Design a protein around this ligand. Structure first.
Ligand SMILES: O=C(O)c1cccnc1
Ligand SMILES: O=C(O)c1cccnc1
Ligand code: PRO
Ligand code: PRO
Ligand SMILES: [Fe+2]
Ligand SMILES: [Fe+2]
Lengths: 168, 168
């Protein structure tokens, strides 16, 4: 019984598009909100990331996995192929790092985890007077890639290599 | 008498090319090194930056003054004119900052305070597969300039403006 209420609290937080207050949980699950307040503390000690906000609780992500630095080279027009490559294999492109001979290591935030975000990003970059960091670096540069597991990373690296992006 | 020993200790530290040990000061000024050790503590409380090292004392800089952010635009080939401009008016070019439309604010260390350093820097930059940050930015970029006083900064800004580098 307690386990079914616990499961239902999570369930409500993954599909609800707005923060859901303790009071709403109590009415939905026919317990007092004081009971809800205990259940939320129990679930966090378990490993769920529920934060309270002025409008109610929200379930947050975290639980990160593996990240690797990958060495690649490609032209400005190959950014879309590369990004879509990583994300379609369940990676996230954290950033780009160029090793600048004068300035040393120059970093750009990317944080691209989905297709929509790849297209938002390529659009911005293809504008006027905006050039990718690899143009400082004669093409060669680094990316920080994140993925759930080491298998997914290899998976991603396989695809990057057979497309011909890896520095090997 | 104490004042003349104090003056002579400083004097020795500005011209000596190697760290000069307490023991060397004592022999040079005909006091015990224990007296030297007191004089060094007296001079620091006064505002001199003497650090002890395994080989002896060295007098260090500090005592910084004013710094400004300056907005400029120029091509890659105009880097030497600009840098020599700032340093010849007693400024130091701390860095370059480009406002990248995608990545936001991208910074490069310059720390160029003398002519020799301007030429070392322009040489590096004029090589192959090394491009200045302003190439991401369609030319416009920022510099952090340091100078002894606010007068010197204006002095420097005057020169930058009449050469046609300022964004105004
Ligand atoms: O800024 C770059 O050079 C860049 C951006 C996205 C993906 N690869 C490189
Ligand atoms: O990197 C640049 O764009 C740069 C370097 C030195 C001076 N001005 C600009
Ligand atoms: O039943 C449980 O305890 C866990 C936590 C909510 C989902 N499953
Ligand atoms: O005589 C003094 O006290 C200061 C400190 C050394 C140089 N002049
Ligand atoms: Fe890339
Ligand atoms: Fe400049």
């Amino acid at each position: 019984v307690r386990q079914e209420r616990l499961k239902s609290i999570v369930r409500i937080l993954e599909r609800s598009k707005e923060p859901v207050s303790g009071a709403q949980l109590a009415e939905e699950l026919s317990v007092s909100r004081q009971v809800i307040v205990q259940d939320i503390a129990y679930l966090r000690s378990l490993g769920y990331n529920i934060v309270a906000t002025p409008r109610g609780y929200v379930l947050a992500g975290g639980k990160s996995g593996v990240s690797r630095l990958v060495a690649v080279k490609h032209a400005p027009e190959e950014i879309k192929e590369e990004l879509l490559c990583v994300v379609r294999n369940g990676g996230r492109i954290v950033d780009v790092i160029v090793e600048h001979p004068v300035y040393g290591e120059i970093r750009g935030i990317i944080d691209v985890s989905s297709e929509e975000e790849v297209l938002k990003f390529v659009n911005l970059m293809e504008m006027a007077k905006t050039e990718p960091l690899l143009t400082l670096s004669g093409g060669v540069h680094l990316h920080t890639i994140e993925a759930p597991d080491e298998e997914t990373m290899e998976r991603i690296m396989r695809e990057l290599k057979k497309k011909g992006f890896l520095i090997e």
